[PDB]
Ligand binder design. Structure first.
Ligand SMILES: COc1ccc(Cl)cc1-c1nn(C)cc1NC(=O)c1cncc2cn(C)nc12
Length: 278
């Protein structure tokens, strides 16, 4: 018996957890005994791209870290089976738990995101989609990177992976090199982390989301990106979140050096946050 093989006959759908343009995540119970005592699992599938999900499955099957959602197996199109985190993403969790998640907890979540991302980069992968919606909450004390749908392998001795396609990109989390040349470096993930940190510090408030704040700064869906690149070239950046200490904001700003080669590393962020937590 292969513990990573989930038979369709016993994989029972319970309800939706979330959905995108092409992907879907559902809560299921894998219930071979048929009495509703089986383990609950999160199941990612595609809406009725298949090659992409097979690549994501193989990436996650080979990642093992406390701040990366656990791979459990497959159901064979194909479905990806993972552990289930009932608290969902930071985007759903933070607005409902502000009283519980103070600055000290926010900085510990920032450390955990950095550790999971640093592990990913050590494996020569660039995530390309780091945002609060992709950070899952295990508990009030732990977060995990929870999706790898856009993840690419950077070739050995190369510094970036080039992605040119017709798909909708999270442009308000993208570094200048991603917007201008579709080049993704590990440092491009650091830029996205700075935006995710801003979301975490604003408790994922929609009125002060990266998209809302950049749209206020820039003033059509087709001219948006050029005005965003120009704003970044001018040295403009997302403002300090409400009640965020300047020392935290300065670490966030080091994520957003214009050139990828000047940005902080994830390990330097971890050390900076650990110094503030002491
Ligand atoms: C990262 O989240 C997503 C990624 C991709 C897509 Cl199509 C949707 C979501 C998502 N949206 N919402 C509202 C809630 C989501 N997920 C979960 O609650 C979830 C829970 N436990 C383990 C999970 C593993 N994954 C991939 N997702 C997991």
């Amino acid at each position: 018996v292969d513990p990573t093989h989930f038979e369709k006959r016993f994989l029972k759908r319970i309800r939706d957890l979330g959905e995108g343009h092409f992907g879907k995540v559902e809560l299921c119970r894998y219930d071979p005994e048929g009495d509703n005592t089986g383990e609950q699992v999160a199941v990612k599938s595609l809406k009725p791209h298949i090659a992409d999900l097979k690549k994501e499955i193989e990436i996650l099957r080979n990642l093992y870290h406390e701040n990366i959602v656990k791979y459990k197996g497959i159901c064979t199109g194909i479905k990806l089976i993972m552990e289930f985190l009932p608290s969902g993403s930071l985007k759903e969790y933070l607005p409902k738990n502000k009283n519980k998640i103070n600055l000290k907890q926010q900085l510990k979540y920032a450390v955990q995101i950095c550790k999971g991302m640093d592990y990913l980069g050590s494996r020569q992968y660039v995530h390309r989609d780091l945002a609060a919606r992709n950070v899952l909450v295990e508990s009030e004390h732990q977060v995990k990177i929870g999706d790898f749908g856009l993840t690419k392998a950077i070739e050995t001795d190369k510094e970036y992976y080039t992605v040119k396609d017709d798909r909708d990109s999270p442009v308000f989390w993208y570094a200048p090199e991603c917007l201008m040349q579709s080049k993704f470096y590990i440092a491009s993930d650091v830029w996205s982390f700075g935006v995710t940190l801003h979301e975490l510090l604003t408790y994922c408030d929609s009125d002060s989301s990266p998209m809302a704040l950049f749209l206020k700064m820039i003033g059509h869906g087709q001219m948006t990106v050029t005005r965003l690149v120009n704003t970044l070239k001018e040295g403009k950046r997302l403002p300090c979140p409400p009640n965020c200490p300047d020392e935290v904001y300065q670490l966030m700003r080091k994520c957003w050096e214009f050139q990828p080669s000047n940005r902080t590393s994830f390990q330097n962020l971890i050390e900076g946050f650990e110094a503030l937590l002491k």
